[PDB]
Structure formats: structure tokens, C-alpha cells
Write an enzyme that holds these catalytic residues in place. Structure first.
Site, PDB file in Angstrom:
ATOM      1  CG  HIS A 165       4.021  13.500  15.664  1.00 56.69           C
ATOM      2  ND1 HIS A 165       4.947  12.517  15.374  1.00 56.69           N
ATOM      3  CD2 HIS A 165       4.473  14.140  16.768  1.00 56.69           C
ATOM      4  CE1 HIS A 165       5.922  12.568  16.264  1.00 56.69           C
ATOM      5  NE2 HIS A 165       5.647  13.530  17.136  1.00 56.69           N
ATOM      6  CB  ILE A 166       3.057  19.455  14.299  1.00 58.80           C
ATOM      7  CG1 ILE A 166       1.753  19.715  13.519  1.00 58.80           C
ATOM      8  CG2 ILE A 166       4.323  19.398  13.401  1.00 58.80           C
ATOM      9  CD1 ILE A 166       1.663  21.129  12.900  1.00 58.80           C
ATOM     10  CE1 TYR A 209       4.453  23.607  12.057  1.00 57.44           C
ATOM     11  CE2 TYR A 209       5.392  25.384  10.692  1.00 57.44           C
ATOM     12  CZ  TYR A 209       4.813  24.107  10.803  1.00 57.44           C
ATOM     13  OH  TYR A 209       4.599  23.366   9.661  1.00 57.44           O
ATOM     14  CB  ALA A 218      11.873  27.376  17.565  1.00 54.41           C
ATOM     15  CB  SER A 219       9.574  22.692  16.701  1.00 50.75           C
ATOM     16  OG  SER A 219       8.575  22.920  15.734  1.00 50.75           O
ATOM     17  CB  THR A 233      -4.223  19.502   5.860  1.00 45.27           C
ATOM     18  OG1 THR A 233      -3.604  20.542   6.628  1.00 45.27           O
ATOM     19  CG2 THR A 233      -3.130  18.635   5.165  1.00 45.27           C
ATOM     20  CD  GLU A 234     -11.622  20.026   6.316  1.00 46.49           C
ATOM     21  OE1 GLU A 234     -11.399  20.711   5.263  1.00 46.49           O
ATOM     22  OE2 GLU A 234     -12.533  19.135   6.371  1.00 46.49           O
TER      23      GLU A 234
HETATM   24  N1  LIG Z   1      -0.590  21.718   6.121  1.00 41.39           N
HETATM   25  C1  LIG Z   1       0.386  22.614   5.802  1.00 41.39           C
HETATM   26  O1  LIG Z   1       0.109  23.679   5.262  1.00 41.39           O
HETATM   27  C2  LIG Z   1       1.811  22.311   6.076  1.00 41.39           C
HETATM   28  C3  LIG Z   1       2.805  23.149   5.565  1.00 41.39           C
HETATM   29  C4  LIG Z   1       4.138  22.825   5.802  1.00 41.39           C
HETATM   30  C5  LIG Z   1       4.430  21.713   6.546  1.00 41.39           C
HETATM   31  N2  LIG Z   1       3.475  20.933   7.046  1.00 41.39           N
HETATM   32  C6  LIG Z   1       3.882  19.780   7.863  1.00 41.39           C
HETATM   33  O2  LIG Z   1       3.164  18.608   7.475  1.00 41.39           O
HETATM   34  C7  LIG Z   1       3.005  17.750   8.646  1.00 41.39           C
HETATM   35  C8  LIG Z   1       1.540  17.401   8.870  1.00 41.39           C
HETATM   36  O3  LIG Z   1       0.749  18.573   8.675  1.00 41.39           O
HETATM   37  P1  LIG Z   1      -0.853  18.491   8.516  1.00 41.39           P
HETATM   38  O4  LIG Z   1      -1.323  19.883   7.993  1.00 41.39           O
HETATM   39  O5  LIG Z   1      -1.216  17.327   7.617  1.00 41.39           O
HETATM   40  O6  LIG Z   1      -1.459  18.245   9.975  1.00 41.39           O
HETATM   41  P2  LIG Z   1      -2.923  17.851  10.571  1.00 41.39           P
HETATM   42  O7  LIG Z   1      -3.959  17.542   9.469  1.00 41.39           O
HETATM   43  O8  LIG Z   1      -3.325  18.933  11.551  1.00 41.39           O
HETATM   44  O9  LIG Z   1      -2.591  16.550  11.416  1.00 41.39           O
HETATM   45  C9  LIG Z   1      -1.733  16.611  12.552  1.00 41.39           C
HETATM   46  C10 LIG Z   1      -1.527  15.154  12.917  1.00 41.39           C
HETATM   47  O10 LIG Z   1      -0.773  15.084  14.148  1.00 41.39           O
HETATM   48  C11 LIG Z   1      -1.563  14.383  15.148  1.00 41.39           C
HETATM   49  N3  LIG Z   1      -1.237  14.968  16.461  1.00 41.39           N
HETATM   50  C12 LIG Z   1      -1.539  16.192  16.967  1.00 41.39           C
HETATM   51  N4  LIG Z   1      -1.062  16.328  18.188  1.00 41.39           N
HETATM   52  C13 LIG Z   1      -0.449  15.176  18.550  1.00 41.39           C
HETATM   53  C14 LIG Z   1       0.214  14.666  19.699  1.00 41.39           C
HETATM   54  N5  LIG Z   1       0.342  15.423  20.816  1.00 41.39           N
HETATM   55  N6  LIG Z   1       0.671  13.418  19.699  1.00 41.39           N
HETATM   56  C15 LIG Z   1       0.526  12.627  18.657  1.00 41.39           C
HETATM   57  N7  LIG Z   1      -0.044  13.065  17.556  1.00 41.39           N
HETATM   58  C16 LIG Z   1      -0.556  14.296  17.451  1.00 41.39           C
HETATM   59  C17 LIG Z   1      -3.015  14.616  14.711  1.00 41.39           C
HETATM   60  O11 LIG Z   1      -3.942  13.616  15.167  1.00 41.39           O
HETATM   61  P3  LIG Z   1      -4.573  13.655  16.627  1.00 41.39           P
HETATM   62  O12 LIG Z   1      -5.110  15.096  16.942  1.00 41.39           O
HETATM   63  O13 LIG Z   1      -5.693  12.566  16.807  1.00 41.39           O
HETATM   64  O14 LIG Z   1      -3.443  13.339  17.674  1.00 41.39           O
HETATM   65  C18 LIG Z   1      -2.893  14.519  13.179  1.00 41.39           C
HETATM   66  O15 LIG Z   1      -2.949  13.156  12.743  1.00 41.39           O
HETATM   67  C19 LIG Z   1       3.509  18.538   9.911  1.00 41.39           C
HETATM   68  O16 LIG Z   1       4.791  18.043  10.302  1.00 41.39           O
HETATM   69  C20 LIG Z   1       3.594  19.987   9.373  1.00 41.39           C
HETATM   70  O17 LIG Z   1       4.623  20.727  10.055  1.00 41.39           O
HETATM   71  C21 LIG Z   1       2.186  21.196   6.833  1.00 41.39           C
HETATM   72  O1  LIG Z   2       4.173  25.370   7.848  1.00 40.06           O
HETATM   73  C1  LIG Z   2       3.408  26.237   7.470  1.00 40.06           C
HETATM   74  N1  LIG Z   2       2.166  26.336   7.928  1.00 40.06           N
HETATM   75  C2  LIG Z   2       1.559  25.423   8.891  1.00 40.06           C
HETATM   76  C3  LIG Z   2       0.088  25.311   8.472  1.00 40.06           C
HETATM   77  C4  LIG Z   2      -0.642  26.659   8.709  1.00 40.06           C
HETATM   78  C5  LIG Z   2      -0.587  27.057  10.197  1.00 40.06           C
HETATM   79  C6  LIG Z   2       0.886  27.198  10.592  1.00 40.06           C
HETATM   80  C7  LIG Z   2       1.671  25.921  10.330  1.00 40.06           C
HETATM   81  C8  LIG Z   2       1.086  24.778  11.157  1.00 40.06           C
HETATM   82  C9  LIG Z   2      -0.416  24.587  10.810  1.00 40.06           C
HETATM   83  O2  LIG Z   2      -0.913  23.526  11.676  1.00 40.06           O
HETATM   84  C10 LIG Z   2      -1.182  25.899  11.064  1.00 40.06           C
HETATM   85  C11 LIG Z   2      -0.586  24.203   9.321  1.00 40.06           C
HETATM   86  C12 LIG Z   2       3.755  27.199   6.390  1.00 40.06           C
HETATM   87  S1  LIG Z   2       4.637  26.557   5.026  1.00 40.06           S
HETATM   88  C13 LIG Z   2       4.435  28.127   4.352  1.00 40.06           C
HETATM   89  O3  LIG Z   2       4.976  28.424   3.134  1.00 40.06           O
HETATM   90  C14 LIG Z   2       4.220  29.288   2.261  1.00 40.06           C
HETATM   91  C15 LIG Z   2       4.647  29.098   0.807  1.00 40.06           C
HETATM   92  O4  LIG Z   2       3.818  28.079   0.243  1.00 40.06           O
HETATM   93  N2  LIG Z   2       3.847  29.102   5.079  1.00 40.06           N
HETATM   94  C16 LIG Z   2       3.378  28.639   6.268  1.00 40.06           C
HETATM   95  C17 LIG Z   2       2.672  29.466   7.278  1.00 40.06           C
HETATM   96  C18 LIG Z   2       1.451  30.138   6.649  1.00 40.06           C
HETATM   97  C19 LIG Z   2       2.727  30.948   6.897  1.00 40.06           C
END
Ligand SMILES: NC(=O)c1ccc[n+]([C@@H]2O[C@H](COP(=O)([O-])OP(=O)(O)OC[C@H]3O[C@@H](n4cnc5c(N)ncnc54)[C@H](OP(=O)(O)O)[C@@H]3O)[C@@H](O)[C@H]2O)c1
Ligand SMILES: O=C(N[C@@H]1[C@@H]2C[C@@H]3C[C@H]1C[C@@](O)(C3)C2)c1sc(OCCO)nc1C1CC1
Ligand SMILES: NC(=O)c1ccc[n+]([C@@H]2O[C@H](COP(=O)([O-])OP(=O)(O)OC[C@H]3O[C@@H](n4cnc5c(N)ncnc54)[C@H](OP(=O)(O)O)[C@@H]3O)[C@@H](O)[C@H]2O)c1
Ligand SMILES: O=C(N[C@@H]1[C@@H]2C[C@@H]3C[C@H]1C[C@@](O)(C3)C2)c1sc(OCCO)nc1C1CC1
Lengths: 260, 266
Positions: free
Chosen positions: A95-96, A158, A160-161, A195-196
């Protein structure tokens, strides 16, 4: 070396699993015949995810709805999850808090909330999970980002965390190798994933290609089940190659003899 | 390239400056004829640092006592320090919460207190100091550690707080090349330093060569004056080589053009 039966009957927690990669992890775990307990704030979305997990073959699938802003919800979630499943083999911390690409200005609030949700809660969850994971020689799976390894603009709080997750869980991992606690810790270093949430946040701003979320989810699970220290996953083969850091590894090992 | 005259007449805050590296940084700054404002909880110790700063030749030296667990104190401190000096050229962020060597167990209080004092207070201070630093095209100097770059046992919470500093301030550094804010950010990656706190904390737990606090302090000032991105200070010439991360910089530059900054720069 990975086989789906490794997850069969395993007791797995997945956070932020109502959508995105989290939900995809729950779906893969269901297909492997694991027991899953998922969490997010939206109980109505979690209900759908859980019903599909059961359709997919999950041994059992349950949900606990709440916010990881609340450390006492967090601490209690793990206990309630372990009682449902009768133990815990894998804790997938994913989660984030909600975030956008924007310059940091004067936003301590967002920094503080990012630290609480993306970091402190993960520590709270770990502390609550640890007795069960010690009983089962379990896994902690920490979902990070490339922004948790390298600096990018627009994601300061983000980043930093995510950097904090690396510092905490990597140090805990060294501690486990000196006190021989048999709990593996897998840091997942992810590039942009389709993701969306990500695709909406990124449109009209970023021109990097996103990797498919289903395969991402699968690569995270594989890495945790095989107990890899880190998993790298990006749509580019290049960045995957460049993410490794042999210097860090040597440096860490250069000081293994330093502790009595 | 560095000359001590670079700091002459500069307006510099040093936090956690009642002892250790912070105090030695204050003394160095004084010798160089800077203006200093030092801070820590202990008024008694701070006053002694300030006196000796004046003897060593500071253009001026002042102190303000208070705790960086208090965010309103952190914010008000920067305003008051600026009033005293008539501006700010350099913010040296050095304080931490007291930490000892210990395996992690359950100490969520310590984890939170480390993130609050060692990281969040630094963000609050930076926000308060930015208007003065933008006007003077000044510098932020963030004191970190080798535990803020690499993993060691017995410092989980500390390491978490230090790692957070890198991700935050390095990410802001990138942002300043898009907004073109002329504030340098220097992350100082330090090895074990012979401060009284550290020499106590380390006895009987870890066997590592400590580096001198005085020369460590000088190196942080040099780096900051020269607006360097990172300063590395450790007793081993090996660790100084292994601590650079060139593939990180490559990955950063390769992605720096992948953003469309138009909306952020107009
Ligand atoms: N998508 C990317 O491009 C990307 C890139 C690098 C890393 N990541 C990492 O992948 C992981 C998931 O990313 P994602 O793109 O799949 O996210 P996502 O589709 O936006 O989903 C975020 C999830 O966290 C839950 N959430 C939000 N706020 C919350 C809170 N206060 N308490 C409990 N739950 C909460 C949301 O559900 P609810 O709103 O119902 O609480 C949802 O299930 C994260 O750790 C992110 O840093 C993602
Ligand atoms: O965590 C990120 N993104 C997350 C993704 C997009 C933004 C910022 C954070 C958190 C979100 O919820 C929103 C989902 C990433 S991972 C990445 O690497 C690029 C090489 O593939 N770049 C990014 C940021 C776009 C520069
Ligand atoms: N020493 C090392 O081996 C070593 C190695 C790597 C990195 N570092 C880094 O170097 C920096 C300085 O370390 P040091 O060894 O020189 O420390 P130190 O001598 O123990 O001094 C700590 C300073 O912070 C102050 N402080 C403590 N709690 C505070 C609070 N809540 N609010 C405001 N001030 C507070 C202390 O004074 P009061 O208690 O009176 O407030 C003192 O001025 C730190 O960032 C540390 O992480 C040190
Ligand atoms: O920050 C540290 N130490 C700090 C120092 C002594 C301990 C731990 C923290 C915080 C202190 O206040 C207490 C001062 C460091 S820096 C380091 O690098 C190894 C090469 O010198 N190792 C350590 C810890 C021993 C692992």
C-alpha cells in the site's frame, strides 16, 4: 526454479490489494491455492477482489478494510489476519498514500503522511507479523520503486518514504543474518507499472513505457517465494541491468567482521 | 579550489552544534570569519560554543536553544536566526535524536522519533529557510552517514531516517534543476567519527576505525562551500571509492529528459 505449488496452502497478507499490483498479487496467489487476507480502505472493492480470488481457486480469501494512517488499525490487522488464517507465511507490504507528480513546495503535510503511510505502517505491520513469521520461517515482501533507489523530480516525499524502506528493511536483514532469524526480506525495485493510478498520474507528463501489472505482480511473488533479497522489474532490459549495485554489497560485507 | 575566505562574512546556521561534528563545524566557520547561529536543546553548552566562536574570530555568533522534536520551534528558529544575521547563505542540518547501538525489536517510539527529528525536522527547516536561501543563492548541507547509503546491523531506525534524507533532498535537487532554484544540496556521507557520543556508543559492540571530528567538519564545510552534491568522509580509502554510485547517476540522467516540464516551468 519457481513452481506455483510453493504458494499452495501458504498464509499470505497483501496490503493495498483492492487495485493495481496488489490486486494482481492477490489474484496470482488465489490461482496458486494460497490463503489470502487483503486490505485497503474500500471494503466494497475488497469484497469484489475476494470473491474473484475464491473463483480463481484460493484456499480461502478474506478482507479487512481500514486505513494504514491508523497504526492501531495496522497492528490489529496483522493479528486478526493471522487468526483468520491460523498463522502467517508471507507479508506483502504494498500500500501507499495517494500521490501525484508535482514539485515540492511547502508540503510538510504530504511528506509527513507519505512517511506515516508508506513507511511507519510498514514497520508497525512487520512488528505485529514477526512472531508468526518466526514460527513459519516466513517472508516479508516490501514493495518499493526505482524512485526508492535513484533520484527523480516530482516525487520527493514519495522517494523519501521508499528510500526509508530500503534503509530500514536492509538493516533488519543484516540483523537477521547475525541473530540467525530465518525471515527473508525481499525489496521490490519497480519501474513504471501500468496501473490505473499510475497511468492517470503520468499522462501528459512522463514518456517512459509502463510494464504490465500482471507480470509485475507475478515477479514480486516469485521473488518472495524464492526469498531473493531484491527483485528488479522494469519494461526496459537496460534499467534492469543498471539497477544492481555491487559497490554497496562489497562495502556491507567489508564490515561484516566489525560486529562482535 | 577551496579557500577559507569563501566563508568569510557568510550567514550560516549549524544545528546540533553544542558538541561533536556540529560544534567543530561552528568553530571552523568562526575561524573563517563567518556569521554563525548555533542550535541544540542545551543552552549551557551552546553558550560556551558561542563564546569560543567569538574568540576564534566569527563575524558574529549567536545561539537559540530548543528541541527539533518541536516543528514550530524548528520553523521559528530559522526566522529568528535570519533576523540575527540579516539573511542566510547556508543551512547546515546536523542534529539527530540520541541513538544507541541495538538490534531492532518493537521500538516503534524510537522509529517514529528518529523519522521526526532526523528527517522531518530537516524538511521543516528547509521550508523555513528557502526564501532566504533563494534570495542569496545559498546552500543546504545535509549531514548523513554511510548507514544512509548502505546496510549495517544495529541502526535500523537511524538508517531509515538517513536513507530518507537522500531520497528527499536528491529528489528536490533534481526539482531545482527544473525550477532553476540556485540552492545547492550537499549530502555528506560519513563513516565512524571520533565524537564523544559515537566512541561511547561503539565500545564493546563494534570494532571500526573512527575518523577525527575536526577534519570531518572541515570536509563538510569545504564540500558545502564548493556546492558539491556529495561529500564522503571515512577513515578507509577503500570505502571512499566504493561509496560512489555511477550507475545511479546514469539512470538519473537517462530519465531526466523523459519528463515534459512545460507545465512546471511556465
Ligand atoms: N504503478 C507504478 O507505476 C509503480 C511504480 C513503482 C512502484 N510502485 C509501487 O507499487 C505499489 C502499488 O502501486 P499501485 O500503482 O498498484 O497502486 P494503486 O493502484 O494506486 O493502489 C494503491 C493501493 O493502496 C490502497 N491505499 C491507499 N491509501 C491507503 C491508506 N491510507 N491505507 C490503506 N490503504 C491505502 C488503495 O486502496 P484504497 O484507496 O481503497 O485504500 C490501493 O489498494 C506501491 O507500493 C508503489 O510504490 C508502483
Ligand atoms: O514509483 C514511480 N511512480 C509512481 C507511479 C506514478 C506516480 C508517482 C509514483 C506513485 C504513483 O501513485 C503516481 C504511481 C516511478 S518508478 C519510475 O521508474 C521509471 C523507469 O521505468 N518512475 C516513476 C515516477 C514516474 C517518475
Ligand atoms: N559520530 C559518528 O560516528 C557519525 C557517523 C556518521 C554520521 N554521523 C552524523 O553526524 C551528525 C552529528 O553527529 P555527532 O556524532 O557529532 O553528534 P553529537 O556529538 O552527539 O551531537 C548531537 C547534537 O544534536 C543535538 N540534539 C540532540 N537531540 C536534539 C533535539 N531533539 N533537538 C535539537 N538538537 C538535538 C545535541 O545537543 P542536545 O542534546 O543538547 O540537544 C548535539 O548538539 C549526525 O547527523 C550523525 O548522524 C555521525
Ligand atoms: O552513523 C554511524 N554511526 C553513528 C554513531 C555511533 C552510534 C550509531 C550512529 C549514531 C550515533 O549517535 C551512535 C553516532 C555509522 S557510520 C558507519 O560506517 C562504517 C565505517 O566507519 N557505521 C556506523 C554505525 C556503526 C554502524
Amino acid at each position: 526454479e519457481f513452481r506455483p505449488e510453493m504458494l499452495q496452502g501458504k498464509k499470505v497478507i497483501v496490503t493495498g490489494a483492492s487495485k493495481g499490483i496488489g490486486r494482481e498479487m492477490a489474484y496470482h496467489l488465489a490461482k496458486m491455492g494460497a490463503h489470502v487476507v487483503v486490505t485497503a480502505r474500500s471494503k466494497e472493492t475488497l469484497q469484489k477482489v475476494v470473491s474473484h480470488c475464491l473463483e480463481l481457486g484460493a484456499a480461502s480469501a478474506h478482507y479487512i478494510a481500514g486505513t494504514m494512517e491508523d497504526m492501531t488499525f495496522a497492528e490489529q490487522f496483522v493479528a486478526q489476519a493471522g487468526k483468520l488464517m491460523g498463522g502467517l507465511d508471507m507479508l506483502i507490504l504494498n500500500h501507499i498514500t495517494n500521490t501525484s507528480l508535482n514539485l515540492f513546495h511547502d508540503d510538510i503535510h504530504h511528506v509527513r503522511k507519505s512517511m506515516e503511510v508508506n513507511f511507519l505502517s510498514y514497520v508497525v505491520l512487520t512488528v505485529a507479523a514477526l512472531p508468526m513469521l518466526k514460527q513459519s520461517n516466513g517472508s516479508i515482501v516490501v514493495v518499493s520503486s526505482l524512485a526508492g533507489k535513484v533520484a527523480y523530480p516530482l516525487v520527493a516525499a514519495y522517494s523519501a518514504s521508499k528510500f526509508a524502506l530500503d534503509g530500514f528493511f536492509s538493516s533488519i536483514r543484516k540483523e537477521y543474518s547475525v541473530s540467525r532469524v530465518n525471515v527473508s526480506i525481499t525489496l521490490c525495485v519497480l519501474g513504471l507499472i501500468d496501473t490505473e493510478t499510475a497511468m492517470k498520474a503520468v499522462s501528459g507528463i512522463v514518456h517512459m513505457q509502463a510494464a504490465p501489472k500482471e507480470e509485475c505482480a507475478l515477479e514480486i511473488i516469485k521473488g518472495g517465494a524464492l526469498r531473493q533479497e531484491e527483485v528488479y522489474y522494469d519494461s526496459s532490459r537496460w534499467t534492469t541491468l543498471l539497477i544492481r549495485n555491487p559497490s554497496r554489497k562489497i562495502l556491507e560485507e567489508l564490515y561484516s567482521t566489525s560486529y562482535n
